[PDB]
Amino acid sequence: RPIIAFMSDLGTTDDSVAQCKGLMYSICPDVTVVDVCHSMTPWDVEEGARYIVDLPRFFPEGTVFATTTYPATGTTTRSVAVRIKQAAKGGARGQWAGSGAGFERAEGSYIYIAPNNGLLTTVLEEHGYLEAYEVTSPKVIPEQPEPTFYSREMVAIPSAHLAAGFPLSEVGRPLEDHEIVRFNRPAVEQDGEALVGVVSAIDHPFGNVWTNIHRTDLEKAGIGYGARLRLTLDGVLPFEAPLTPTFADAGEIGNIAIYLNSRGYLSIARNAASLAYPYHLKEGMSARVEA
Amino acid sequence: RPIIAFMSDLGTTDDSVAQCKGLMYSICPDVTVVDVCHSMTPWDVEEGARYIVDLPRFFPEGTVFATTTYPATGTTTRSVAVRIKQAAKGGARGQWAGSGAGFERAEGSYIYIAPNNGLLTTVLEEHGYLEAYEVTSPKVIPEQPEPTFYSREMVAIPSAHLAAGFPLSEVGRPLEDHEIVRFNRPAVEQDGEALVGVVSAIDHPFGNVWTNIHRTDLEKAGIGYGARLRLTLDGVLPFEAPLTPTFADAGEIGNIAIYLNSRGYLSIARNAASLAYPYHLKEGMSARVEA
Amino acid sequence: RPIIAFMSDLGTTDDSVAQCKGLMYSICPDVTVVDVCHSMTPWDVEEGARYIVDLPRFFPEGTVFATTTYPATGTTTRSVAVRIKQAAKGGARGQWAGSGAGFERAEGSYIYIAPNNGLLTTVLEEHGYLEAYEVTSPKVIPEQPEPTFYSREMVAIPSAHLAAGFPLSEVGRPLEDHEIVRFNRPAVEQDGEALVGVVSAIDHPFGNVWTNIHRTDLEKAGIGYGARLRLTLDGVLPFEAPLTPTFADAGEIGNIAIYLNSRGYLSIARNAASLAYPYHLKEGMSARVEA
Amino acid sequence: RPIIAFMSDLGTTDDSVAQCKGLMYSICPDVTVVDVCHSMTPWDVEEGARYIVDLPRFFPEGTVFATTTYPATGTTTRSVAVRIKQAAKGGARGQWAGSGAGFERAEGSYIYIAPNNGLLTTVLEEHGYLEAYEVTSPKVIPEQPEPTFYSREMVAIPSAHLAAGFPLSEVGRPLEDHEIVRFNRPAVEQDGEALVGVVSAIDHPFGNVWTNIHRTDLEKAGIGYGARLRLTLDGVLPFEAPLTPTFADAGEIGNIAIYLNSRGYLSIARNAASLAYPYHLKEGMSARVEA
Amino acid sequence: RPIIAFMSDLGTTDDSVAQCKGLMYSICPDVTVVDVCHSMTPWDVEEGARYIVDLPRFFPEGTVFATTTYPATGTTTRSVAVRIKQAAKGGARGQWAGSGAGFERAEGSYIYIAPNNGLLTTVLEEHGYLEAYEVTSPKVIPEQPEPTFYSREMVAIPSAHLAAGFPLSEVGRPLEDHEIVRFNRPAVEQDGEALVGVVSAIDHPFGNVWTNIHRTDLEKAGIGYGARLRLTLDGVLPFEAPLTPTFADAGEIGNIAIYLNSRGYLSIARNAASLAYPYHLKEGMSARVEA
Amino acid sequence: RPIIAFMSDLGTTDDSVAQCKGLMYSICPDVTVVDVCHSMTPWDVEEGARYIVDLPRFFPEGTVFATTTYPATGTTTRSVAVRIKQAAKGGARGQWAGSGAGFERAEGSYIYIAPNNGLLTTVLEEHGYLEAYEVTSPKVIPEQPEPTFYSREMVAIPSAHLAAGFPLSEVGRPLEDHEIVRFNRPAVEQDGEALVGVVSAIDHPFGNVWTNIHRTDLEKAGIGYGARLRLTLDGVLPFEAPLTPTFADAGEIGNIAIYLNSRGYLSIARNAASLAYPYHLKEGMSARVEA
Ligand SMILES: Nc1ncnc2c1ncn2[C@@H]1O[C@H](C(F)F)[C@@H](O)C1O
Ligand SMILES: Nc1ncnc2c1ncn2[C@@H]1O[C@H](C(F)F)[C@@H](O)C1O
Ligand SMILES: Nc1ncnc2c1ncn2[C@@H]1O[C@H](C(F)F)[C@@H](O)[C@@H]1O
């Protein structure tokens, strides 16, 4: 019962994703295709990375992740297919997902296939990898690929072959580590006592504000649950609240909650109301936190 | 071939729904996950209720409905799992769904699992229930649930256990009727000869106007197809048309149609044009109808 | 392993598509339902046609295409079910889809079911057909169809019967060619040396501009890759670039690319930036191209 | 103490109006320049006409009206200067303006100077004229007029000469009636018992709705104050109210008032709330009224 | 050389203000009409009050203030004309306006004429008055006033008679204090050490934030220039800055300044950047200040 | 009959301009105050400069220009008052303004008073100056200036004293040329045969596009009326048209006109339609022209 989990920038306003899916079912008739999301800002590899980095612990072992924004479509570039090492714990605390104590996942149990454009940067950082190959074999890609549709030709199609049991090491030559393109992750800075980062995302549809300041950055500064924080956004808008596990800890509906989100990052919200939308807060705004 | 039909407020702009789905396939490998919708206004339990109340007659017996907006995530609250009684006929006329005379559904054939926050109010009103339990067993929920993701921990995960055949009565203790939270449904008033209600929804993507005035309210006042109606919206827009089965009965494109929608409620539209969008008509505007 | 590929105007903001899907799984328990898209402009048959015409070569033989915008819902009209002839090659070059040399598809291998309102015009033009029937049998549609939901009653339901192996010729009487409604496709004009057409679509989410000027129209005028073109939009915005296979051929990010899209049509874009959105370019604007 | 009343399409976002005013004070040092308005939709002669037709009865005898939208700037066209005949009563009732019984104005007491492009159509209809001349003398216009600024060269400048006492008949040759350009005023139609016109303006900043249905059209159909009217806008939105003199006659704040505006035309509003803005009502929408 | 300073809700998008001005020049040929502003939110008497309360010290003695929003137009209501007592100092410090030590203004030197609807509430509070009359004489208003234009009939017209020297006490009968309508001014509360008020206005076009917390409220709590303040907006934005005289005192462009505005009220801004516009801050949001 | 022509960033949404005007009439009772405009983007000295540089030739000799955006309000900075040298010809051709051959203006006939922040940069470039003084005397400014209102205290007030005949050289000490702050005017570059500049302004309310490419730049490259030009905006929207004197020379309504505007600069428009608004063209976009 193979699964392909599919993340693209193709949208859901026409038949583009469906063309990919038709080919996936053609190649691997028993496959289940699970949509991750298709609404990422086109060509924003850092955003795409956020939608795929946390996936493995949630999925059955053997799942293939087909993950693509492909602005270099129709060039001599070729996709990378990697078998990751650690499925990796996650969340506010760092745990396995599932009922009971969670579902522990075996190492080496997931494949990602993507443009070699840095989309897999955080996947490789957080999970490591056991093997990586350039995707070139005409057994798994078209001999004559559609120039403007490499997300289909060089990701969707070969992902379905991999789901069907095509040997990963036969997709093409092995890639050395330096040949796998990475984007630079801007660091969270210490600035005296304060941590200085950025709003990584507006958390739709709630309008919560997610920062790139991780639990580990907070722990490094001695900030734990209960600490009274001043969190300043965009250089201008300050908020003040204690760090709490969840939204309802802020008390009344509309009150500010500062918390660790389900991906492990410092975040700010209103309790059962939107923070971001009324004040037009945006990704890329500065985020400074201090006790 | 178990089915989980999944309705949430998690959106389709990131991997949140996919994390839930991964766990569903982990727990119940043979499951089919059917998206109901994920775009409800967050925390609007009355809107969520509208998206789930009409579902049972359309689905195979044994379907599990995983339905969630979870503003009390991370608190001591626990979900409710209920086996409904009547699958219930529906539509403008009140019938079974499907070809021929429709698919008759057996009683006691569907389970809903939801936050205990009133989301199931109309489900319980229209279908009744045979049994209801608090969802507490660590066999079906995490021992250490993610504080900000109870839609996953307390709905998605246990729904998959239920779909896999976990006995409903083993999820936790039985709930008495008064322990199942309800929202108040404002009634349709008789006001002399007129029926007085509200616009329950703008029917996207068409911009039809749906009211909370049901067929049964119309029947009570003697109003049937062919009756010349005056339907006043927002206190000031007195539209006049006969009640007709469908949009084309209004004649020319753009003309006003007053009709019974597919959920059994009095509605108003233009024939193959949008009523609501040009005039910015809104949910919560008053709706008065009279012969 | 039957597949139904489902394209509607029902949106993804409520349970409407899910009601259709529940019935599809009820009728054909082994089916896979693949969403094409549900976000087309309601009642715009020409737009719907664009989302369904290219599908067959991507899907396994035996796939049923359930394709619907149904403004004549609740009238005496009945759907048409057709078995197409040629699956048809496609793309910028005209080829089979898939890995290697592509997946050759047998003739007569796909069924479309749709309102008989011209939605299938381009399907029939590009693929031909072997047989066409009016959908009337109460074995495949409701005896008492919901007046305002013919997309469910007269498309979704009978599509599932067809996917389950109900004989196509038993759905109702054969239709003569003249009884299958067509929309008029406005032609691309030659105007001296220039080709004169329209913007057929803004290609979301990228904001590329797609025209109705086909590869075959370009070939007729001797225009091939490398030709320096002047492409004028809306009568007044001229652009100049060579015809290239893909976006990156324009060089620097933001530069103009004029290319053949993956559906075989002359298009214009910026390289990894949006052309249409900053300048509010729109479907229906004139498009003139000349060497 | 001469007055120039100045209406243009030049806006108030730069120094354009001030350049005109500087020249007016240069030519006629004792002049008072009164702004009518400068925010008309550029080139919309019918809208400009509405802002100038009602002016004369309000101003001291001898006032010059400099009124201009000049899309034919820099062509061989020349402005028209006219001395009107009747100052003309106005309002809901048809009266002189001012305290007591009002200020009766002598005939032949006002000059309009405008592009000869139909801007003065309604001025001439409602007031008549005694004499009209083409504005060509280099004593009152530049010998070398700025091509793109005829509103200054051919209206503002010569208006100041006229205000200073330059003889009207010396500005250039007399114009015959047929040489004075007119726009066509679309008529109010009788359609059975109903009057069928258009929304002539959204009355900013209040969002009242003004129609082209005049008091005289209402009188012709026997409609007077107290008559219960059904007024339908845009073919779709009906309203019902009695015809009243003013807004407060509707009773509660927000209630619909149907009234005669201060220019003599049938209008619709909410009492101390905006009608047009919440429903996005627009100029050019149809307006049908019936008893 | 009489002056009428004219504040209305009539806008500057048509000839309405000009009709008023024409009549003013008709009645008082030597008058100078000074526009205060015409863009107030219609019917918002509290906003109108803010635009007129600070005026007297800036104008020559004998100036008439014609100030009007007239939602009760066409009713039996009549305007009030008042001679104020103290011209009153103003500003951040409380001083006369002008060069040197400023222009000292004599008592009893200004007349306001307005609808008797509370528009003059703050004028009377801050300046006091010596005499007040109902405006009823047909020597100064029309015998047959236009029902929908009392801002012209009952304010503009009689203001011009007053400017021309018509005796104030002859406009109609004297009004007792209780017959002059007032709106309620919500007070600034002391709440422990903090002062609790509201954002009175967004200061356009800069987007500074003006509160109803006056210098005198600050002085009462011992707060002077240099005091480190915490100013919380909307319950959740706790800005921190010293109280400074001006914007540049915040240092770098964009930094927060907390200051006393030119009307004497506690305000917050960014230095040469907009505070309110990026964050959509609004009038009516709470404003709490504390040392 | 003195004139003050007043340009500020104070807007027209409250009484701020009126406070300034009241003081101007207080100081100089016979003055005429002419509004230039009050809607400039706050603190944008380059934009303010565009609204004041062309004024002198239009106004009577002796006019005082009070021109202000004052972001350094409340600091030790003081305004500059300058007597300009040449009134300077202007327009597409370079001429005097007015009827006949125009009104020749004597040298040394206009005074500007402004913040010393570079607002007068282009005034001084295009007109030169005879004398410049720092504005410090308490005879012409307040002894205790309102910290946040220097546009009133240090521009409006002293302008009225200057209009009233206060000797310019007594306002304070003479300023050396290097003490008068200037902004840098980016040059128009020659780039092979092409001229490379920027869109200096969107010409509201028409949506014409004004560039910083002057007649003199065109003359330098041999470009005169009749030359076929390619004008490229924003790097990517090319237009092609001959250089013509005016809009109507483009022929049909909506056609592209490339012309010299009334300020002497290369511009592009549509004939009696908006160019900028439909395509959201903006100030600061690149503008390249070539024959
Ligand atoms: N204007 C553009 N420039 C660069 N890439 C584009 C593009 N429009 C779409 N794409 C890209 O083409 C990919 C396709 F191969 F699948 C999509 O995934 C893209 O991101
Ligand atoms: N793009 C355009 N096309 C035609 N006329 C225009 C224009 N832009 C401004 N105008 C016109 O030029 C006049 C001027 F002579 F005073 C203005 O009154 C205009 O309406
Ligand atoms: N700002 C907020 N306040 C309260 N609940 C929120 C929230 N943002 C998201 N949620 C809620 O978290 C749930 C999650 F547990 F699944 C979502 O279903 C909720 O709507």
Ligand SMILES: Nc1ncnc2c1ncn2[C@@H]1O[C@H](C(F)F)[C@@H](O)[C@@H]1O
């Ligand atoms: N829809 C409306 N309801 C109440 N008053 C209105 C109105 N529209 C305009 N006004 C009012 O009419 C006055 C006029 F007499 F001068 C204006 O000053 C008012 O605000």
Ligand SMILES: Nc1ncnc2c1ncn2[C@@H]1O[C@H](C(F)F)[C@@H](O)[C@H]1O
């Ligand atoms: N206001 C309207 N007028 C005409 N058709 C409409 C409509 N609103 C929805 N529809 C149509 O009803 C169909 C249904 F039967 F499935 C949808 O597919 C529609 O296109």
Ligand SMILES: Nc1ncnc2c1ncn2[C@@H]1O[C@H](C(F)F)[C@@H](O)[C@H]1O
């Ligand atoms: N937030 C702000 N920061 C800097 N200057 C400002 C400002 N708000 C208004 N101004 C400035 O204050 C001046 C005044 F003194 F007249 C106005 O002309 C301003 O440009």
